[PDB]
């Protein structure tokens, strides 16, 4: 869809619950960066890309 997927971002998402994280850069679909975590149960959670906790979670995953 050519629209922002995250109308609000969620708090309290833990690394242990995350299966994957998708980072989508700005463009025609959305002028803001969007971060969507897919949890181990299949839930999708929109995350604040600016958040220092979100940056820490993604860098922890890369190790």
């Amino acid at each position, epitope marked *: 869809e050519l*629209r*922002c997927q995250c109308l609000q971002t969620l708090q309290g998402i833990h690394l242990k619950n995350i299966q994957s994280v998708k980072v989508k850069s*700005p463009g025609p679909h959305c*002028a803001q960066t969007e971060v969507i975590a897919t949890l181990k149960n299949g839930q999708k959670a929109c995350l604040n890309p600016a958040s220092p906790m979100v940056k820490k979670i993604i860098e922890k995953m890369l190790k």
Partner: antibody
Amino acid sequence: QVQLVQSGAEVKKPGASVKVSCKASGYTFTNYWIVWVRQAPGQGLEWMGDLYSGGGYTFYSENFKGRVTMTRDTSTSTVYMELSSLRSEDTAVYYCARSGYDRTWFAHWGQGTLVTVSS
Amino acid sequence: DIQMTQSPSSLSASVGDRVTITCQASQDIESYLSWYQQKPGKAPKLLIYYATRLADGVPSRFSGSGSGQDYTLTISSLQPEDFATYYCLQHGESPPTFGQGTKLEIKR
């Protein structure tokens, strides 16, 4: 400091075409969509179509497909809407607007251009 | 296309009154709904986007609510400068479509 400046009012005869410009300033032109909305008597506001200023997407309303063309010029940060095969009923104010975070909402609007079609 | 029904088509209210304007979509638009104010001879101006978010610079007296097919714009304490026509816009499905507008008149 976002500004959208449109070309001045025009008068045209039936069968002519009109090309309205929308010059953008105060933001990165290629990161947003420009949409065209017309305001004709008894019809409130009507979306005509839109295009992504960075390229790749142009969409037209089925009510105007076949006689509307929208174009973009990155070097002048300008978008144009050309409406062809004009009829007296195309008399209306034509607005351009820039998208917000996406093309679902219109964050900034041009001042409008009144186009009158008359013999 | 999605039909947007705005209610009422016109209303009269006094300064300090709370004003409520509703917008109903013919199908679920998933909160891709925005509200605009238009003064006579002027371009529309954004008030609210994604159903509830207030645009930059817009006074806190404006608020939006709703989901699915039903949305509401509220002005908590009407001011003289709120004289205008108000429109809703959906873009949950293309083409985007507008409500017919609500003309807000001031009693004084």
